[PDB]
Structure formats: C-alpha cells, structure tokens
Ligand binder design. Structure first.
Ligand SMILES: Nc1ncnc2c1ncn2[C@@H]1O[C@H](CSCC[C@H](N)C(=O)O)[C@@H](O)[C@H]1O
Ligand SMILES: [Zn+2]
Ligand SMILES: [Zn+2]
Length: 849
C-alpha cells in the first residue's frame, strides 16, 4: 500500500466540518471577494473568471512554463488559464476547449487585455479531438473522487489523451492522482519521452493531491510525489493554520496587437548609460532570451541579491488601539503590499507594461495648439528660471542629508551637467540622486515659484491645502452650468503619449539660451528617453534587467506633479470643446483643421473654462456649461486618457451636489457648528485612514519611531478628520498612550507636525487663517468642535452603534494603560477628558466617591 492511499483514507474519515477547515489549512489562496462581486455585477474588465488564472500565474513567473505561439487550453472551463496567457509576450494565439453543458462550466466572455486572440469553444470533448499544431499545450482536466481507484482510471485516460499533443513544446498538464502505482509508470514513461518534472502548486487545496507536470524542469518523480503526500499528512496535525492570502491577478482590458506591440528605442541617447552599467557589472552580464518585456526595450541582465518584502511592517501602537478593525478585510488588504522581485514583475505586467495608441493627426494638432496657448497664459507674469544649489540644499536639510555636504558629489554633477550641455546623458538612471538635482536645476522653478497656483493657473490647486479644497469645490458649484464631473484616469503616468511629452517641451521657448539648452536636455535625455532598473526572479536566482521606453511618465521625478497638472488641464479643455460642439469627429480625423475656430474659442471663452475646473495631477473636477460634456468621449479616448472602471464609450455620471464629488481621494462635507457658523471638512472612507495608519513605511523601526509615527497620524485626525466620532476618539487615545514630549516624525512637515496644543492649532487653521470664516470668534473647547451626522458618519464607514466599537470606546482606558506599560516610566497626559463623555464621567464619578 502506497503513502498516498493512506492519505485518502484519512481524508474520507473527516467530517464535513473537519473537511472544510483542513481544505484551506495552511494553503495559499487569492482574495476573490472583489472579483466575484464584479463578475456578479457584470464587470467585463480587469477581472479573472476563476482562481485558475493566479493558479497558472505561479508557474509562469517561476519559468516552469513559458507559453509560446498557439496555446491550446484543454478544459478551459471558465477560461481562467486562457485569459491569463493572452496577456503574455510570446503568445500569438489562444484556443480553448471545454465540454460544457449541464454539470460543466461554460466559457465566460471577457474584454480583458488580449481577449481578441482568445478563442473559447464549448461542446468540445477533448478525448475525441484530433491533435492540432501548437507550441503550447495546457490541460486542467480531472475530476476528484472518494475512491482512489476511480481517480486512477481518470488520470491514466487523460495522460493517454494529452500524449499526442506534446511535440517538443511547452506544456502544463494537471495530474489528478499521481500517488497511484500504475499512474507513476505512465508518468515515468512520459518523462523519458517528453522530459519535464512534476510540481505541486501551493495554491492547490489540501483536499486534493493534484500535481502539475510542467515542461521546464527536472528531478525524480517518485520522490517528489511522496514529499507532497508527507506534507498533506503533516497538515492533518495542524489545521487552524490561517491560509496565506495574496492579491488576485489584474488581466487589464483592451485589445492586443502583437505586431505593433514591441518597442523601437533610440540608442545614441541612452547607449552611454547602458554601456556604463554593462561595464560595471561585466562579471555576470548576460542576455536573457525569455524576458517578459513587451512594450519596453530589453537590453540585458545581471545577477543581484533579493530586495524587498512580501508583507509590510505593522504599526503596533495603533493596532493595539484599533482592535475592532482587526476583523475588517479592507484594513488588512492595505498591508498586503508585495515588494519582492516576484511582486515587482507582477506589478510591472499588470499596469506598467502597456502601450497607448498613437493619437489621430487631428487630435495631435489640437493638443499642440492648446499647449502653446496654455503655456503663454501660464507665463503671462512669471518668467522661467534656473534653480540654485542653495535652494536644493535648504529643502534637503528640511544618507541623503549628508550627501549634500560632500563636495565630491557636486563635482560629479558638473561632469554630468556638461554632458547634458553637449546633448549627452551618462548617469541618469531611474529605480523602481544626481539626476534629480539636474532636473530641479532646470524645471524646479515650476514648484518653487508656484506656477500652478490657482491665482496664476486658474484651475490648479497647488499650495492651497487639503482643508481648503472643499471650499474651492463649493465655489465651483455656484457657477451656473451642468453637473460636476470627476473622472479618474486608470494609470495616468502610463498613458502619456510621445505627443504629450513634446507639448510639455514647449515651455523651453520662454527660457534663456543657457537655461533652454539645459532644459531641452532634461526633456530629451531623461524624459523622452529613460533607463529604468527592475528586479526579476530567475531559476538561477535574482537578476536586474535594464529596460527603456520613449514615452509614458516616470513616477519618481521632479516635474511629475507639474507636467501632469498641465497636460490634464489641456485634456479637459479639449473635451469641453467636443462637448460644446467646437471639435467634431471629422476634425479629429482631419490632419488639416482650421485653427481659427479653436483659437477664437481659447481667446474668448478659454479663461472662464479654466475657472470651472479644479485639477491636481491626474485627479480633476470639471463643471461644464452643460451636460453634453458627459457624452464627449471621442477625444478623451483618442488622447489615450481612458477612464477607470467604466466602458470606453459609456457617458460619465456627474453630481449636482459638491459634497458627493470625489477629488484627491476625498469627498467633502458642510457641517454647522453650535454657534451657527459653517465649516467645510475633508472626508473619506474610514477604513482607508485607519488602513494607512496601521502601516509603517520601511521596516526595523523601534518602538519610539513607531510611536512618533502614530502621533503624527493621530494629530492629523484631530486636525482634519475631527468630525469623525471614531477617529477623534482614537486620536485622543493615541495621544494619551504616546508621551507628550516625544516629537512626531515622519515623511512630512504639514500643519500637524508640531508639539503645540492641537486645540490652539485648530483655531488657527479653521478660524484664524480661514478666508471663508468671517466670524473670528475662537473655539474654547473640543466639545464645541462639531461632528458629522450619525447617519452621515456611519455611511462613511463609522462603527458607532456596533457592540465591538461600544465595548472598545468604553474600555479604551485599558488599552491606553497597556501601551504606557510597554513604553516605561515617562510623562504622559490624559486626552480623554477632551470630549464630553469622560468629562461628565469625571465631574460626576469623581465628585461622588
Ligand atoms: N471530457 C471533457 N472534455 C472537455 N472539457 C472537459 C471534459 N471533462 C471535463 N471538462 C471541463 O474541464 C474543466 C476543468 S476545471 C477548468 C478550470 C480552468 N483551468 C479555469 O481556470 O477556469 C471543467 O470546466 C469541465 O467542464
Ligand atoms: Zn544624465
Ligand atoms: Zn464623508
């Protein structure tokens, strides 16, 4: 009797209760909550039809199987494997086959990225199908059964059927019952003939002993099978082991054309940079032929060491205080950020590795026209200038702070600067410093002189602040016209065309020859051409790939916020023209459109249209003259700026209430104080704020560093989200647990980064320095500081009314004392009497006994 047979007997003895717990015991699975809800509501993009997609992902990213050419998916079912293979590089065609009908899953039509090459066919029994020419053979067919003898026959029948399909090509077939003796005989027979290796997938549940025969690998079958049996028999002991949860795969959307997909880069610009990297790492420099890069130019690779973590460090301070939110899924999801080399490749493929189609000649014309009009308007007063070393140093001080004191660092800059003056680049490489200074030296004037301030840009909101954004949107709502629209763009930086960059290049026309020659270098050598390093796992280890592309946008740049704000202002303007009827479908296709009607529209109506918008980076809020703006989608899509989570040809939905308008990941409320005065406060789903608070940027932070981080978020809540009952209570709880004298430190210098009394700060922010507050009468206590409506608060994710929150908020005194005990004998202060409940529980309970 084999080892596998002993496992089956134990599996059958388990009750239905014991079976369900052991099934997902210690395994790995993906969060299908958002996916299943989406498919239920009829969402056709970004989603995977089943868990098979991520199940097949585990093999590909480890190079166990590399799907090439025609891909045949025997037993596609829902089509989990097919839609995933569609988004792969070396795949040219995907064909699916499933029996379907009653009792069997039917193929689910999707519009994910690469759907156009996917061909799913129902009513196909693979056992009666003659083999076809394919460079990749996939099979996930196998039905489990309590009797191992039954699984034995079902496994062998599949093996005999998938055999003629394998002709020195990539493959990945599912083996239902690998532990049966007669099955192994066939496996060993097929191993000597087609090679490969049998591998167990961690995403497979413990209820099945299924293993997958991959093409790329080697090893002993008999040993590997028994190791799986020993594992499943070992997991019988420990059952309550929580399954490792991972993020599901984003299959994106849109059609895929393999012919016009690859990248044709320029070399004489970036070649010097590549050469220096190659010579530095000439020890292990090589060219990986199986690179997954599609729309990016692959140059080479070299061996490195692993960098990054699968999970993020949890701020223990706030976690001990936000106990009721330990059961909330949304809060947990925000700490599941994967930064491992495996994750870097997963993130790259799903969002970074895409190509935006070249805009129509007519559209390219209007974009150029509006750009020159916009730059001339932005520079009506301010003149472009060169930033200084003194400015750079001052902002750095307010390691990295030690690198500026090193004189050798500044001389390296000069050597790189003179190259830029010669139209050459050598050391400017982006990662997933000296280059950043050179950009600041040229384009830093946009932020320092505040080019995108509302006083100068009419639409921009740079330097205003979060607490003033709400008042801005309220003023916009007063402007007559249609509803307020606010569409978010899916991956803005990945949708910047080459035409968009050339329009941003026109700013150099207002610069001095010595400034212009340096600025054009930054645009041409660092923006319109760039080299990025990115980690990638290989069967030999971790390597660093060198890629390049001549468009899109670098996330970590100096002019990231600026240029995105500029182009977005341009993008929304064109859409209004389409809405008003200025630009027609013919005009966008016409390479020679009359600029008379466009210029006249900009010279006359152009100013007011800018006053109807509030734009910050990719986020934008537009209140057009009418609701024709909603159906204006021809130009917005042709520019490559496709909206997120919505069909490309579906009219946008606007709001006539400014309180429901989303902007900068926030909505705003207008509440009424006890004195009758009105305030406009920022707001967002409560699970997000707590989710951000329970994470800690970086790892290996001491208790003090985590406590100082906690106090920062705490005072942030007390200043911005005071209107929330749960957050204000948590804020005072943290401040009570965190030592008073300890200075809050984190990656900021906002208005909550001080040691002053927050009450006095609140009066300075919302009363003193508030231009929308005519009555400067100060507020003497937090009890006069208004909350949201209980109905309003609960809808925003509050937990008020629940037993868990009720138990917490009243037993908060214990958790605070617990934190204080861990810190030690230091000086604290009770922030709980700041609110009414504990103040009445101190004037009563205190005076009684
Ligand atoms: N004889 C047969 N011929 C073709 N398909 C069959 C078959 N017997 C079963 N199937 C199909 O095989 C599929 C196995 S489940 C497929 C899951 C797939 N990998 C995904 O990720 O969606 C079932 O959907 C079943 O309908
Ligand atoms: Zn350079
Ligand atoms: Zn709200």
């Amino acid at each position: 009797e084999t080892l596998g047979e002993k496992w089956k007997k134990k599996l059958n003895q388990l009750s239905r209760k014991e079976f369900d717990l052991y099934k997902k015991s210690g395994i790995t699975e993906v969060d299908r909550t958002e996916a299943k809800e989406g498919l239920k509501r009829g969402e056709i993009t970004h989603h995977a039809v089943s868990r098979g997609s991520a199940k097949l992902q585990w093999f590909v990213e480890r190079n166990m199987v590399i799907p090439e050419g025609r891909v045949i998916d025997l037993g596609c079912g829902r089509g989990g494997w097919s839609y995933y293979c569609a988004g792969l590089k070396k795949v040219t065609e995907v064909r699916g086959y499933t029996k379907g009908g009653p009792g069997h899953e039917e193929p689910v039509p999707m519009s994910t990225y690469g759907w156009n090459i996917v061909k799913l066919m129902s009513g196909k029994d693979v056992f009666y199908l003659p083999p076809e020419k394919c460079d990749t053979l996939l099979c996930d067919i196998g039905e489990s059964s309590p009797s191992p003898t039954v699984e034995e026959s079902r496994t062998i029948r599949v093996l005999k059927m998938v055999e003629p399909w394998l002709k020195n090509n990539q493959f990945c077939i599912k083996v239902l019952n690998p532990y049966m003796p007669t099955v192994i005989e066939h496996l060993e027979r097929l191993q000597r003939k087609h090679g490969g290796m049998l591998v167990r997938n961690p995403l497979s549940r413990n209820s099945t002993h299924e293993m997958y025969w991959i093409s790329n690998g080697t090893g002993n079958i008999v040993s590997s099978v028994n190791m799986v049996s020993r594992l499943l028999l070992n997991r019988f002991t420990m059952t309550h082991r929580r399954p490792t949860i991972e993020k599901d795969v984003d299959l994106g959307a849109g059609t895929r054309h393999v012919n016009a997909e690859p990248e044709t880069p320029n070399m004489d610009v970036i070649g010097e940079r590549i050469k220096r990297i190659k010579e530095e790492h000439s020890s292990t420099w090589h060219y990986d032929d199986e690179n997954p890069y599609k729309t990016w130019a692959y140059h080479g690779s070299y061996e490195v060491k692993a960098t990054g973590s699968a999970s993020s460090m949890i701020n223990g301070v706030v976690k001990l205080l936000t106990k009721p939110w330990d059961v909330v899924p949304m809060v947990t999801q925000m700490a599941m950020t994967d930064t491992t080399p495996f994750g870097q490749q997963r993130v790259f493929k799903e969002k970074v590795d895409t190509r935006t189609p070249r805009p129509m000649p007519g559209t390219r014309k209007v974009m150029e026209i509006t750009a020159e009009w916009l730059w001339r308007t932005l520079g009506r007063n301010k003149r472009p200038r060169l930033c200084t070393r003194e400015e750079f140093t001052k902002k750095v001080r307010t390691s990295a702070r030690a690198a500026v004191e090193d004189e050798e660092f500044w001389k390296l800059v000069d050597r790189e600067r003179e190259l830029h003056k010669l139209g050459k680049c050598g050391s400017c490489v982006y990662n997933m410093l000296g280059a950043r200074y050179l950009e600041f030296e040229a384009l830093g004037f946009l932020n320092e002189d505040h080019w995108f301030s509302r006083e100068n840009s009419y639409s921009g909101v740079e330097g205003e602040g979060l607490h003033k954004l709400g008042y801005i949107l309220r003023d916009i709502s007063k402007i007559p016209g249609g509803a307020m629209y606010a569409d978010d763009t899916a991956g803005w930086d990945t949708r910047i065309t080459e035409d968009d960059l050339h329009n941003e290049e026109k700013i150099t026309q207002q610069m001095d020859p010595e400034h212009r020659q340096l600025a054009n270098a930054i645009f041409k050598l660092t923006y319109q051409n760039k080299v990025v390093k990115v980690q990638r796992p290989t069967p030999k280890g971790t390597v660093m790939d060198i890629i390049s592309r001549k468009d899109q946008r670098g996330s970590g740049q100096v002019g990231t916020y600026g240029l995105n704000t500029f182009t977005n202002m341009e993008a929304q303007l064109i859409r209004q023209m389409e809405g008003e009827g200025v630009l027609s479908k013919a005009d966008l296709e016409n390479p020679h459109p009359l600029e008379k009607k466009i210029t006249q529209w900009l010279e006359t109506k152009g100013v007011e249209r800018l006053k109807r918008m509030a734009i910050s980076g990719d986020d934008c809020v537009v209140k057009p003259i009418d609701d024709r703006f909603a159906n204006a989608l021809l130009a917005l899509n042709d520019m490559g700026k496709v909206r997120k989570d919505i069909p490309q040809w579906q009219p946008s939905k606007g709001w006539h209430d400014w309180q429901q308008v989303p902007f900068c990941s926030h909505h705003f409320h207008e509440l009424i104080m006890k004195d009758g005065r009105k305030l406009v406060v920022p707001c967002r789903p409560q699970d997000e704020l707590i989710g951000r608070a329970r994470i800690s940027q970086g790892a290996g932070w001491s208790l003090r560093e985590t406590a100082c981080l906690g106090k920062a978020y705490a005072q942030m809540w007390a200043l911005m989200y005071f209107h929330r009952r749960d957050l204000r209570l948590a804020s005072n709880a943290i401040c009570s647990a965190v030592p008073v004298h300890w200075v809050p430190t984190s990656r900021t210098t906002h208005q909550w980064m001080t040691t002053e009394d927050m009450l006095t700060v609140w009066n300075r922010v919302w009363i003193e320095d508030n231009p929308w507050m005519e009555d400067k009468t100060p507020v003497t206590t937090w009890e006069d500081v208004p909350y949201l409506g209980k109905r309003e608060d609960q809808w925003c994710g509050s937990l008020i009314g629940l037993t868990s929150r009720a138990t917490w908020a009243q037993n908060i005194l214990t958790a605070i004392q617990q934190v204080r005990s861990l810190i030690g004998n230091e000086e604290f202060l009770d922030y709980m009497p700041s609110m009414k409940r504990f103040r009445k529980e101190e004037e009563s309970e205190g005076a009684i006994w």
